[PDB]
Amino acid sequence: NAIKYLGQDYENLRARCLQNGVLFQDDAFPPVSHSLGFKELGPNSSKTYGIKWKRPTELLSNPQFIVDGATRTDICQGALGDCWLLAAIASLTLNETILHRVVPYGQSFQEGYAGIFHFQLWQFGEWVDVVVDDLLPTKDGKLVFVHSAQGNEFWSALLEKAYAKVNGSYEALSGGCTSEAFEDFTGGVTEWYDLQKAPSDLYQIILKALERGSLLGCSINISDIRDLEAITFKNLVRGHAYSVTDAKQVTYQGQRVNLIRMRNPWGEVEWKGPWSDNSYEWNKVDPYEREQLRVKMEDGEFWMSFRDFIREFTKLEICNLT
Ligand SMILES: *[C@H](C(=O)OCC)[C@@H](O)C(=O)N[C@@H](CC=C)C(=O)N[C@@H](CCCNC(=N)N)C(=O)N[C@@H](Cc1c[nH]c2ccccc12)C(N)=O
Ligand SMILES: [Ca+2]
Ligand SMILES: [Ca+2]
């Protein structure tokens, strides 16, 4: 059994709120500016000024904790520099077992609802249960930070809030290391690869990692400072964490081509080179591979050849589960 962060007891708090006819408000991470941040999201900042804390049950008639699965499309970054955390959550969803350790089953906005949710994280050398109230930062009725493509879905928003909580505030999340998020979801072992020095068996390493349900993400280090833009010529975002979500081989004009699939945690802004959703390359693979693999959609997720991936990106991080 997970130990209670700060002694806060999810089921006890929930049953007591329901008995008392109230919705939970979290003393440990209250719905006030200090839970947003301290500087950029401080009490005297532009960003903070627009923000009102509202429950999904105040936003919508039918809020849902999970809709059509807890899946990577549910992870669409908002106005916070927490790409590294969101990339890890999207990777997490590909491993159903570790997903539902972090995201306990049986949580909802209907029967037993008392405005409190909980998540489990690997923190302080312990698996910890973390509670949150479901007050969320909103502006003009819309979530400011993470949201799902499914606008009535709230699990990822609540998980991001619980992760903010353990780190002190949402602002505390602005900038970080994907592998740090991977570890907090697994207690696993992280390693990283310098892609300009990729071992010759790197594609097999990625294949095996994905098969065992390890978490993988990737990034392009901005080397000069940002002095060729943040967005590259072929629509990649530098210094930005992407989730690695698949690796598959296609037969391209009778020749095997190793592909890798990645996802921008923005849920949009995709690679425009070979194997991108609209690329010609797909005209030349057999129709069955093309239909299994290519999804023509602005969803943040796209394919690159492994060759192009290693030239464009600089760093792969892999968290292996023990
Ligand atoms: C995530 C993102 O939201 O993209 C925007 C939509 C992205 O900003 C991000 O966090 N990227 C990180 C890795 C993902 C690929 C990344 O490249 N760097 C952060 C981790 C480095 C941690 N610091 C360290 N090891 N010393 C990062 O940028 N961290 C901070 C940078 C920083 C450090 N000191 C600073 C002083 C002044 C200004 C910035 C400073 C940060 N807070 O951004
Ligand atoms: Ca979903
Ligand atoms: Ca796409």
Curated annotation (Swiss-Prot):
The modification Phosphothreonine is found at T322. Residues 23-322 form the Calpain catalytic domain. The active site is at C83, H240, N264. It is found in: Cytoplasm; Cell membrane. Undergoes calcium-induced successive autoproteolytic cleavages that generate a membrane-bound 78 kDa active form and an intracellular 75 kDa active form. Calpastatin reduces with high efficiency the transition from 78 kDa to 75 kDa calpain forms. Calcium-regulated non-lysosomal thiol-protease which catalyzes limited proteolysis of substrates involved in cytoskeletal remodeling and signal transduction. Proteolytically cleaves CTBP1 at 'Asn-364', 'Gly-377' and 'His-399'. Cleaves and activates caspase-7 (CASP7). Belongs to the peptidase C2 family. Forms a heterodimer with a small (regulatory) subunit CAPNS1. This is Calpain-1 catalytic subunit. It comes from Rattus norvegicus. The lineage of its organism: Eukaryota, Metazoa, Chordata, Craniata, Vertebrata. The gene is Capn1. The chain holds residues 33 to 354 of 713 of the full protein.
